[PDB]
Amino acid sequence: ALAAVANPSYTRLDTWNLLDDACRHLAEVDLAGLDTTHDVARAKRLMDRIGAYERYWLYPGAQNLATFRAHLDSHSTVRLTEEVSLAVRLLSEYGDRTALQQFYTVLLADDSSLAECLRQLRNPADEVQFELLVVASIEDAITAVALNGEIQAAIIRHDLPLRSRDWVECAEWIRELRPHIDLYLLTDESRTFYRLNDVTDLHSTVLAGLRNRYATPFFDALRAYAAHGNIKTAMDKAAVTWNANQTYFVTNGTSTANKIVVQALTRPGDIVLIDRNCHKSHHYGLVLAGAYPMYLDAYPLPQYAIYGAVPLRTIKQALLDLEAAGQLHRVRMLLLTNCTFDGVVYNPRRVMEEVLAIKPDICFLWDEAWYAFATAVPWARQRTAMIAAERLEQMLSTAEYAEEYRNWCASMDGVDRSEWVDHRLLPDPNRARVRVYATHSTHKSLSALRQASMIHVRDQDFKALTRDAFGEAFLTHTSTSPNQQLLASLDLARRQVDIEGFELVRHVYNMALVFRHRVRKDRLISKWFRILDESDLVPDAFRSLADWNEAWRSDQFVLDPTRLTLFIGATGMNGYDFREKILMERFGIQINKTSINSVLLIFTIGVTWSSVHYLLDVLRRVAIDLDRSQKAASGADLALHRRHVEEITQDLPHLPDFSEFDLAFRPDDASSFGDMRSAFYAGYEEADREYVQIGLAGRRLAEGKTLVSTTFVVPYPPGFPVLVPGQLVSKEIIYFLAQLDVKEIHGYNPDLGLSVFTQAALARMEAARNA
């Protein structure tokens, strides 16, 4: 899987340009009559390196790499230079088209011809064209697909040598590495084919699959207009792309997709386990639904003032506490953001397994707004909610899993349920129901238009339990005149993932890893700038190429490299004012979040190596100016700068945990879930609301006049509601908000103070809550 990201093959385009400049240099040597030995040896070495992988690309190929070796071994420098220049020119735009309209590479794994028959079947006028990349082994097939993103389809012989010269298991590896490419089987034994009998129906089937994954029914219909129907087909193709059972297009973003799902699954007073640092759209969806959130604290990253992911032990503990309270039955759903804004990726399969061990019929909503692209690539795909859900269902169905569960139950003889937090947990096969949901803001990660989203449903009980509720929620939240351009953009993004998705997203990951490497190695940047590692953003408690492939497979959290938290603390300037006065003011670089000492940069499918050079050059320029200041600075200026660096990096205020809801708003005194809807509307009783200055708040806590938030206080440096309606304003929250000079705090106005419930109000509400 993750090996596909790291190989010479991805940099092959650069290596071919390198060959084109070595070959030109060889020509410049030969035209001068000088000793060619140096540049012939250079070109030979480069081409021999290229020959490690060029067999897997249609146009330059082994045939023409060999032809160039033959030309070079005859010192035909002029011809060799001309042909290499031509080859790399065609390569730059015609990646594989020069092998011969849509054009796709089709892998044929056949050591045997079928290739020539399929070529003869090709009609040059057809709208979609392909050329066969023939490979003579299973290992060569898997390498070809993984390395070559252009291989839209694969054709596999039943008889194939596993060893490389230089079958169901081959097919499963192709499906694993390249989830969207069409995979076909040939079988001479007395989709699968008979190779001799059907080369014309094989050709037709390959063309049909390619058109199926290229055709955009709704975008084409909208073009024809502008010049149950096509929208159903587009949603079905989206479901097939994102491994959902059903897909629902939403034209008010994932803010509204979240609410549709929450309302569909939750009735008023359903307990929802939710990441405390969830998107605000979840907080508002909860107040709308009237569900009782039990907020789960994401583990702290004190050095950076950012939250991580919610540890699985936290979820398990919450569920088991609710069970001890007898409130587990009420619990209806867990809301987790599969990739945190900062890039901390949950392992959904493990979280759903251990949660369904506690609550076999809980629903999962994964707010994967940033991870729509992830389905394109196997390493991130496996961590996607729909793929995790399918894999979990397929495990729960297997008899071998049933034996494994029986052994696990035997291992759990006499273990208390309270202890279950200590031990890894397996869902019951005969009770665990897989009811997984995802919401994708396609625009954030893909070409889709802004405000276009996709709810992905893989729920075993959707048709009975949730279909009517989900229809009524969809009618509640969507407008009756949805914008057709947004839906067509979702169809276009689906087609992009289906065809271009693997190469695009793999390139994004490559570019993010290249940027990380260049920033780390470069001594001029590295002294002033840092990009936070897995070890920075993911504690050891949660981390256990082979080891890095296993990390994405099996670790609880991984850092997605495409989320690039540039730590700037060594520069001694706020993240906010680094974004403003350097990135935006000087360089126009947009970024997604700022932090006290770090700036988050998210690479997307549109990133190019030119963008990576731009960012690297920008950081080099800033480092140069910082070195200029350091060498011009007096000892007093150096002292001030060192003080700023300490302020930005050392005495950071710990981001506060969720202080509980007030007993006025916790329905169960024994349980942490709160009636946050009630507190939300109660905060609009102006007789019940008052304002407490934060300088007075800390003293009032000593008086015991319990401060309880009426409103979502949402400081931007965290970026999350630090208080929610009905939340106890704790000593740590007072302290945090006091240590903030930032002017963008929503719901908190330092001119007035914290909007808090009056003690009389709280007393009355507590009385009501009792009786």
Ligand X SMILES: Cc1ncc(COP(=O)(O)O)c(C=O)c1O
Using rule CB under 8 A, residue 449 touches a second copy: yes
Q: Which residues contact 209 (CB under 8 A, 6 or more apart)?
A: 153, 182, 184
Nearest approach, Cβ of residue 557 and ligand X (Å): 16
Q: Which does 302 bind (CB under 5 to 8 A by kind): a second copy, ligand X, none?
A: none
Supply 227's token pair: 């010049």
Q: Which does 97 bind (CB under 5 to 8 A by kind): ligand X, a second copy, none?
A: none
Helices then strands, counting H and E runs in the chain, come out as 31, 24
Nearest approach, Cβ of residue 225 and ligand X (Å): 18
DSSP state string for 645-679 = HHHHHTSPPPPPP-PPBPTTT-SSTTS----HHHH
Q: Which residues contact 75 (CB under 8 A, 6 or more apart)?
A: 30, 36, 40
Whose CA is closest to 652, among 754, 555, 740? 740
Residues 438 and 384 sit within 8 Å (Cβ to Cβ): yes
Instruction: Report the residue from 256, 277, 337, 384 that binds a second copy according to the rule CB under 8 A.
Output: 256
Comparing CB distances to a second copy, the nearer of 287 and 301 is 287
Q: Which does 337 bind (CB under 5 to 8 A by kind): a second copy, ligand X, none?
A: ligand X
Q: Which does 476 bind (CB under 5 to 8 A by kind): a second copy, ligand X, none?
A: a second copy
Please tell me what DSSP assigns to residue 299: P
Using rule CB under 8 A, residue 439 touches a second copy: no
Q: Which residues contact 756 (CB under 8 A, 6 or more apart)?
A: 689, 690, 691, 692, 707, 708, 709, 710, 729
C-alpha 324: how far from chain center: 35
Near a second copy by CB under 8 A, which window of 248-256, 370-378, 506-514, 759-767?
248-256
Comparing CB distances to a second copy, the nearer of 194 and 284 is 284
Nearest approach, Cβ of residue 281 and ligand X (Å): 5
Please tell me what DSSP assigns to residue 279: -
Comparing CB distances to ligand X, the nearer of 480 and 770 is 480
Instruction: Report the residue from 280, 391, 620, 705 that binds a second copy according to the rule CB under 8 A.
Output: 280
Residue 400 half-sphere exposure toward CB, CA atoms < 13 A: 2
Q: Which does 449 bind (CB under 5 to 8 A by kind): ligand X, a second copy, none?
A: a second copy
Residues 458 and 245 sit within 8 Å (Cβ to Cβ): yes
Report how many residues bind a second copy under the rule CB under 8 A. 41
Near a second copy by CB under 8 A, which window of 192-200, 476-484, 602-610, 758-766?
476-484
Instruction: Report the residue from 67, 303, 460, 478 that binds a second copy according to the rule CB under 8 A.
Output: 478
Q: Which does 484 bind (CB under 5 to 8 A by kind): ligand X, a second copy, none?
A: a second copy
Kindly identify the residues of this chain, within the stretch 452-471, that bind a second copy according to CB under 8 A. Answer: 452, 468-469
Q: Which does 573 bind (CB under 5 to 8 A by kind): ligand X, a second copy, none?
A: none
Q: Using CB atoms within 10 Å of the CB of residue 604, give its burial: 0 to 12 exposed, 13 to 18 middle, 19+ buried.
A: middle
Comparing CB distances to ligand X, the nearer of 367 and 459 is 367
Using rule CB under 8 A, residue 486 touches a second copy: yes
Near a second copy by CB under 8 A, which window of 56-64, 236-244, 280-288, 350-358?
280-288
Q: Which does 245 bind (CB under 5 to 8 A by kind): a second copy, ligand X, none?
A: none
Rg (the chain; Cα; Å): 29
Using rule CB under 8 A, residue 76 touches a second copy: no
Kindly identify the residues of this chain, within the stretch 655-684, that bind a second copy according to CB under 8 A. Answer: 680-681, 684
Using rule CB under 8 A, residue 267 touches a second copy: yes
**What residues line the site for ligand X (CB under 6 A)?**
253-255, 279, 281, 337, 341, 367, 369-370, 441, 444, 451, 453, 479-481
Residues 108 and 152 sit within 8 Å (Cβ to Cβ): no
Q: Which does 469 bind (CB under 5 to 8 A by kind): a second copy, ligand X, none?
A: a second copy
Whose CA is closest to 477, among 246, 202, 234, 256? 256
Nearest approach, Cβ of residue 592 and a second copy (Å): 11
Angle between helix 199-214 and helix 114-121 axes, rounded to 10 deg: 60
Comparing CB distances to ligand X, the nearer of 503 and 560 is 560
Nearest approach, Cβ of residue 440 and ligand X (Å): 9
Comparing CB distances to ligand X, the nearer of 156 and 558 is 558
Q: What span, in angstroms and rounded, lies between the C-alpha atoms of 307 and 405?
A: 34
Comparing CB distances to a second copy, the nearer of 280 and 644 is 280
Nearest approach, Cβ of residue 758 and a second copy (Å): 16
Q: What span, in angstroms and rounded, lies between the C-alpha atoms of 662 and 619?
A: 47
Residues 443 and 452 sit within 8 Å (Cβ to Cβ): yes
C-alpha 482: how far from chain center: 27
Instruction: Report the residue from 116, 472, 550, 744 that binds a second copy according to the rule CB under 8 A.
Output: 472
Instruction: Report the residue from 129, 143, 254, 556 that binds a second copy according to the rule CB under 8 A.
Output: 254
Nearest approach, Cβ of residue 531 and ligand X (Å): 20
Q: Which does 367 bind (CB under 5 to 8 A by kind): a second copy, ligand X, none?
A: ligand X
Residues 456 and 384 sit within 8 Å (Cβ to Cβ): no
Q: What span, in angstroms and rounded, lies between the C-alpha atoms of 661 and 153?
A: 55
Q: What span, in angstroms and rounded, lies between the C-alpha atoms of 576 and 399?
A: 55
Looking at 242-324, which runs of residues are DSSP E strands? 246-250, 271-275, 292-296, 300-301, 306-307
Residue 573 backbone dihedrals phi, psi, to 5 degrees: -130, 140
Nearest approach, Cβ of residue 656 and ligand X (Å): 21
What dihedral angle (degrees, nearest 10) is formed by the CA atoms of 228, 233, 235, 238? 170
Q: Using CB atoms within 10 Å of the CB of residue 254, give its burial: 0 to 12 exposed, 13 to 18 middle, 19+ buried.
A: buried
Whose CA is closest to 172, among 193, 145, 197? 145
Nearest approach, Cβ of residue 3 and ligand X (Å): 29
Residues 244 and 263 sit within 8 Å (Cβ to Cβ): no
Q: Which does 98 bind (CB under 5 to 8 A by kind): ligand X, a second copy, none?
A: none
Using rule CB under 8 A, residue 604 touches a second copy: no
Supply 279's token pair: 């998107």
Nearest approach, Cβ of residue 372 and ligand X (Å): 10
Instruction: Report the residue from 216, 241, 451, 496 that binds a second copy according to the rule CB under 8 A.
Output: 451
Q: What span, in angstroms and rounded, lies between the C-alpha atoms of 74 and 530?
A: 50
Q: Which does 288 bind (CB under 5 to 8 A by kind): ligand X, a second copy, none?
A: a second copy
Pairing of strands 128-135, 102-109: parallel
Q: Which does 77 bind (CB under 5 to 8 A by kind): ligand X, a second copy, none?
A: none
Comparing CB distances to ligand X, the nearer of 280 and 764 is 280
Query: Position 676: which residue type?
Result: M
Q: Which does 711 bind (CB under 5 to 8 A by kind): ligand X, a second copy, none?
A: a second copy
Comparing CB distances to ligand X, the nearer of 266 and 659 is 266
Using rule CB under 8 A, residue 113 touches a second copy: no
Instruction: Report the residue from 129, 255, 337, 571 that binds a second copy according to the rule CB under 8 A.
Output: 255
Using rule CB under 8 A, residue 481 touches a second copy: yes
Nearest approach, Cβ of residue 490 and ligand X (Å): 12
**C-alpha separations of 404 from 352, 410, 426, 590 in Å:** 17, 10, 9, 50
Q: What span, in angstroms and rounded, lies between the C-alpha atoms of 736 and 749?
A: 15
Nearest approach, Cβ of residue 685 and a second copy (Å): 8
Near a second copy by CB under 8 A, which window of 162-170, 274-282, 417-425, 503-511?
274-282
Q: Which residues in this chain contact a second copy in the complex, by CB under 8 A?
A: 251-256, 267-268, 279-281, 284, 287-288, 441, 443-444, 449-452, 468-469, 472, 475-486, 680-681, 684, 711-712
